[PDB]
């Protein structure tokens, strides 16, 4: 069983200068909260500890991007980082990440705001991303795949019951994952651009994710 009630509790349980430095600080800060969020996802802690590491190292980036995007539904053409800094189109452009910034807004933030994606639907999507059967090295990808199927099974039932007149809402939610996949890959590149150049301090936790 995969009750959406607890996935929502996981989302509820983990909520609260230079733009580049703030980005790195926020990512490192929210990596800790991500672990506490994952622990609260049903059946995640039951998996082998090595698979938990693989799933978190494989989805931490998309998981955090989905978090601040939904968190930025209220900001007017901008992004709200975990450090409390609001990065708008001007600061992002002057920071050299104007292109990927626009993508985050047009493909994620704005799309989330238009359909009024609630925190239950957000958690289910993040739970789906967490239960990634494509992660390399998983001792039992089938079990991870089974948990994923349980997740979007509870989500679809939630959407049909919560929004009975939006039959395509369930499909619309899942169809934001491809954008999250490509956006995450691009954001990860900039993180290496930031780290590689040494221009921006990289803290321990984020540093560990950026390494082998």
């Amino acid at each position: 069983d995969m009750p959406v009630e607890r996935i929502l509790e996981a989302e509820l349980a983990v909520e609260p200068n230079d733009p580049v430095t703030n980005i790195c600080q926020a990512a490192d800060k929210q990596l800790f909260t991500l672990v506490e969020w994952a622990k609260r996802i049903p059946h995640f802690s039951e998996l082998p500890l090595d698979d938990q590491v693989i799933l978190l190292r494989a989805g931490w980036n998309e998981l955090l991007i989905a978090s601040f995007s939904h968190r930025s539904i209220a900001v007017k053409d901008g992004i709200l980082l975990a450090t409390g800094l609001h990065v708008h189109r001007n600061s992002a452009h002057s920071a050299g990440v104007g292109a990927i910034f626009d993508r985050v807004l047009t493909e994620l933030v704005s799309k989330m705001r238009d359909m009024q994606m609630d925190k239950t639907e957000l958690g289910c999507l993040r739970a789906i991303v967490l239960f990634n059967p494509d992660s390399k090295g998983l001792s039992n990808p089938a079990e991870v795949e089974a948990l994923r199927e349980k997740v979007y099974a509870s989500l679809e039932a939630y959407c049909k019951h919560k929004y009975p007149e939006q039959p395509g809402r369930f499909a619309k939610l899942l169809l934001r994952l491809p954008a999250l996949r490509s956006i995450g890959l691009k954001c990860l590149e900039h993180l290496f651009f930031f780290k590689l150049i040494g221009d921006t301090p990289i803290d321990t936790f984020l540093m560990e994710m950026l390494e082998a």
């Binding site: 800790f32 672990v35 994952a38 622990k39 500890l49 938990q52 590491v53 978190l56 190292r57 321990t204 936790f205 560990e208 994710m209």
Partner: peptide, 8 residues
């Protein structure tokens, strides 16, 4: 390492 210790 830190990820391993935080999960435990």
């Amino acid at each position: 390492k830190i990820l391993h210790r935080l999960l435990q």
